[PDB]
Amino acid sequence: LSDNAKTLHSQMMSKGIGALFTQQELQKQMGIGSLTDLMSIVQELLDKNLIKLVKQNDELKFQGVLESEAQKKATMSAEEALVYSYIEASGREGIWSKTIKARTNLHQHVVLKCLKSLESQRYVKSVKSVKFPTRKIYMLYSLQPSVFTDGELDIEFINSLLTIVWRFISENTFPNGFKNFENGPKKNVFYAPNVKNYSTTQEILEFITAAQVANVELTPSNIRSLCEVLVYDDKLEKVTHDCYRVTLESILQMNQGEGEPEAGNKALEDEEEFSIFNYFKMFPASKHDKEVVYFDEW
């Protein structure tokens, strides 16, 4: 550039946190008309653009980066630095391809050659969302927003964390090995079930704090609440505050493995509804009206 020292004046006024008072001082120093003319020239020299608001004029935004250069990445075209300036101020998540199609009413293959020519020098470093409605991608840097602690956590360690918190609440809110056999289960449960009768109340996050893998497992008591909602709508009752009560299906499908062997105690009553075990009907054997009755393709 090198017009005058007002580039250094713009650097000194854009060093710190600036506002409209900085432009008030910049118009306050010298005579007003030459300052307005030369400031319009400096803003035409690839600098900060003004903002139309209730107030007069603002800066964009607080820093003195000044990196567009308008002619030099590989070739010369006055369309590429424009698109780079369009993706500078995308905001929190990014910008669509349909949004940049809607603005500037250009073609889509010029957007594709902008994609290629700016991917050739690493400014199209995108962040991917969990879902892809219209490719909400192509932000500047750092893959910052991520809409993702439990959302992008699919699938195997959600099941692993679910299994270990099920084990921990089953061993906390009930004793350890008294669910295996019926030889006096739990000893008049929790010693005449009065005032002991406790639960975790932030102790579950302490047990998570006892062991992690340090990738996404620092949960600020909100992903724990999401898994809490995920467990009380299937197999937990959870009377009002934090008392879980894991039971009424934990014992059967926990002690079915090496705790409920053959030659048991007594034969079961017909049609126990709370039971998923030993239901088979055919080697091939589906001749007559066996259990082939349900819903029959209405």
Partner: protein
């Protein structure tokens, strides 16, 4: 195959760094673009 050809493939070290100087002076931009392309790769394959 000793017919003055097996004893005339390579010369000494002296008139070889001059050839290396010629090669690095001329065929330079392609080697710089290849090394910079490797640096571009090992930049942009770190994230996902």
């Amino acid at each position: 195959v000793d017919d003055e050809e097996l004893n005339a493939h390579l010369l000494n070290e002296e008139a070889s760094k001059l050839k290396e100087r010629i090669w690095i002076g001329l065929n330079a931009d392609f080697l710089l673009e290849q090394e910079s392309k490797r640096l571009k790769q090992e930049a942009d394959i770190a994230t996902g």
